[PDB]
Design a protein around this ligand. Structure first.
Ligand code: HEM
Ligand code: HEM
Ligand code: HEM
Ligand code: HEM
Ligand SMILES: [Xe]
Ligand SMILES: [Xe]
Ligand SMILES: [Xe]
Ligand SMILES: [Xe]
Ligand SMILES: [Xe]
Ligand SMILES: [Xe]
Ligand SMILES: [Xe]
Ligand SMILES: [Xe]
Ligand SMILES: [Xe]
Ligand SMILES: [Xe]
Lengths: 146, 141, 146, 141
């Protein structure tokens, strides 16, 4: 669950090649397509009638940018994920009412996107590293729930 | 999935519950909210304090749905169809939460059925609640 | 840590009434009846062919007593569950090859047993305290898996 | 349920896998063992080292069962009947692990089908693996 130093390096190295806005928009759109009950939070976002409508939706895209931007910044704080996400955890629980299972679903979708985007570069050990990170972030964001 | 013996066990247990079904439904929701605080994310509009009329009213509805299931045990998808629609389409409760409420329903039954809640009946009830859960999430995608 | 004062006191007070030998046998027997695939760890335990056979099985009862005895010891160390179960964690991983999901299933069953045995005194608050415990113990037992 | 469109999507994407099915099964298993080390508890009798014949062999068997399922998508319970018996009565793998293996198969598919892994196809594949997992665990109790 810890990351090893080589795991940290591998995560940093891959993430340096990521277009965060693009990966964000695609990860969020895929969440809403693959697990369409996650759409419950986004009735104000307009057209989500079809897979193409969700993926093309600029409000979905904007929200993906926001979420993955925060994720990205969090990668600078792998040693202190709970501290770094605490206030976001409080907000998601107290104001947004987001079931933390949604974080784990998004982590699954993120891993699939990275695998699609990077192909063979997203090796089994690199995936193992990312699976620790997405676990860590989801835990951090769920930590202040009560 | 549910054997003749499972169906018999479920009906015997739910038979003994009888008119307390509503009460036990509310007690199960309460157990869930306290034990698994993340489930409260679905009820931001509810007063969830002990004795809440909202929790009692919802407990009765959940109980009545289970009674309907039990009565239509060989035809549960159709019995619960409108509820599957409602959970899949509107409420959009993450599927993981159904196992939490099922567990708390199991615990409630246990706390109230000293004679009935045998190992065998426990096993059938767990199966029965898993089946209900499956039907209720069956239209999610 | 994770348990509040009211929760620790509820855990200790209920456990004062627990016949650890009996409750252990009942809990283990129920695990093997309710989730019968768990019998895979007990090939040598004799007749497990019917619920009455599982529950009356002296090897099940014996081992149930051992398991819950170790659980009971851990309740004296609620702030250090990881340290307290580390040695048993490695054992379960390296020698016994037990999927840690079984610990979670055992927690479920234990909670149901306590409810069945204590009835009304096993209140929603007492259960919530026990749920934190069983999650804690399962996490501690899973912690040294690799 | 798998929709007719799901079935179209799966057949298309799996046809593409084609002759790599064995290699892909093995890679998915390795992804599982590395990402989810508790899954190794089911393989204590195995050489799990990278490129081992045992992982490659098991990879192929898993791939071929999946091919069989895609081929008989309309009646997976019958097609996977022996395999369902085996997991339920002998192997007795905790049902939680199927989701982990399914995730790893999906990641393997994404890493090898850049052209074909659209959001719609992703959804269909996820549903399909979920359906296969349901069939394989259907006789557990
Ligand atoms: C990587 C995990 C996630 C991170 C880092 C994250 C982060 C954020 C941030 C930075 C905001 C803006 C907060 C503010 O206004 O100050 C936000 C808002 C929000 N998030 Fe999360 N989030 C995550 C996952 C999710 C998921 C999975 C969902 C639902 C499926 C969700 C639902 C929402 C909603 C509904 C808002 C309010 C947005 C608005 O009002 O336009 N989040 N999140
Ligand atoms: C045993 C499984 C379940 C059954 C039988 C069940 C049944 C029902 C029933 C009968 C209703 C009322 C529908 C109506 O007539 O208006 C309802 C609504 C609702 N349920 Fe489910 N449910 C189950 C699981 C869950 C779970 C696990 C959650 C979340 C933790 C949940 C959250 C809700 C919510 C938020 C409503 C709307 C409540 C309101 O606004 O009044 N349900 N359910
Ligand atoms: C509260 C959680 C658990 C604790 C504290 C625990 C502790 C122990 C202890 C102390 C022993 C050795 C007993 C002795 O001195 O002979 C043992 C052995 C064993 N345990 Fe665990 N255990 C737990 C849960 C489980 C579960 C859920 C399973 C499987 C479903 C399991 C499978 C085994 C097996 C197969 C052995 C070896 C039994 C034999 O000698 O054949 N344990 N455990
Ligand atoms: C998509 C889900 C799965 C499929 C299609 C599948 C299929 C298969 C097949 C075809 C075999 C060989 C049967 C034979 O020799 O006739 C097998 C065996 C086996 N599987 Fe499953 N399986 C799945 C899930 C799992 C999971 C999740 C685990 C554990 C994490 C698991 C553990 C095992 C083990 C230990 C064997 C015996 C291997 C040996 O000793 O040769 N399986 N499976
Ligand atoms: Xe790595
Ligand atoms: Xe995440
Ligand atoms: Xe029930
Ligand atoms: Xe109940
Ligand atoms: Xe409620
Ligand atoms: Xe036990
Ligand atoms: Xe436990
Ligand atoms: Xe595969
Ligand atoms: Xe293997
Ligand atoms: Xe597949």
């Amino acid at each position: 669950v810890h990351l090893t130093p080589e795991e940290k390096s591998a995560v940093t190295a891959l993430w340096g090649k990521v277009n965060v806005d693009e990966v964000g928009g695609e990860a969020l759109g895929r969440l809403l397509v693959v697990y369409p009950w996650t759409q419950r939070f986004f009735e104000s976002f307009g057209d989500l009638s079809t897979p193409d409508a969700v993926m093309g939706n600029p409000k979905v895209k904007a929200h993906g940018k926001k979420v993955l931007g925060a994720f990205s910044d969090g990668l600078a704080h792998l040693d202190n994920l709970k501290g770094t996400f605490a206030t976001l955890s409080e907000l998601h629980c107290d104001k947004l009412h987001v079931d933390p299972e949604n974080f784990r679903l998004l982590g699954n979708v993120l891993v699939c996107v990275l695998a699609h985007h990077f192909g063979k570069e997203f090796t089994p050990p690199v995936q193992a590293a990312y699976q620790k990170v997405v676990a860590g972030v989801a835990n951090a964001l769920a930590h202040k729930y009560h | 999935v549910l054997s003749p013996a499972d169906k018999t066990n479920v009906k015997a247990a739910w038979g003994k519950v009888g008119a307390h079904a509503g009460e036990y439904g509310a007690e199960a929701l309460e157990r869930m909210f306290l034990s698994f605080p993340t489930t409260k994310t679905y009820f931001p509009h509810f007063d969830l304090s002990h004795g809440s009329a909202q929790v009692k009213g919802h407990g009765k509805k959940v109980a009545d749905a289970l009674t309907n299931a039990v009565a239509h045990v060989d035809d549960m998808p159709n019995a619960l169809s409108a509820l599957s629609d409602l959970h899949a389409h509107k409420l959009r409760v993450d599927p993981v939460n159904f196992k939490l409420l099922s567990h708390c329903l199991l615990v409630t039954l246990a706390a109230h059925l000293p004679a009935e809640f045998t190992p065998a009946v426990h096993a059938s009830l767990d199966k029965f609640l898993a089946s209900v859960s499956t039907v209720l999430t069956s239209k999610y995608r």
